[PDB]
Amino acid sequence: GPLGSMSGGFELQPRDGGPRVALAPGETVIGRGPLLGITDKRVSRRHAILEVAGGQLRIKPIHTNPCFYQSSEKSQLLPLKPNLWCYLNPGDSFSMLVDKYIFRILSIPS
């Protein structure tokens, strides 16, 4: 029959060892601001959107200054396509600059 609901939450782990950030259900706009403590003026205050729903995490870059993605299996942060949602797997990383503000996706309970 019908599959029903799926749970599962997410946390961001900064590559530089800063504190982890748990994500709320639904959409969270990320970028320069107090949530992640990013202050570099090259990151927009409305840089990307993250969405947690149904046990999945997706990201959408929303600024001309891009976001980057590194699959857990690979070794280079590469640009994400502008303005498109992309699912992120636990263990993957994304970043707000090519070489700074890099976060690994961890799986946690909802």
């Binding site: 320069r32 107090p34 202050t39 003026k41 990151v43 927009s44 205050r45 200054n65």
Partner: peptide
């Protein structure tokens, strides 16, 4: 965080 984004 009041300053405009650098492009």
């Amino acid at each position: 965080y009041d300053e405009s984004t650098d492009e």
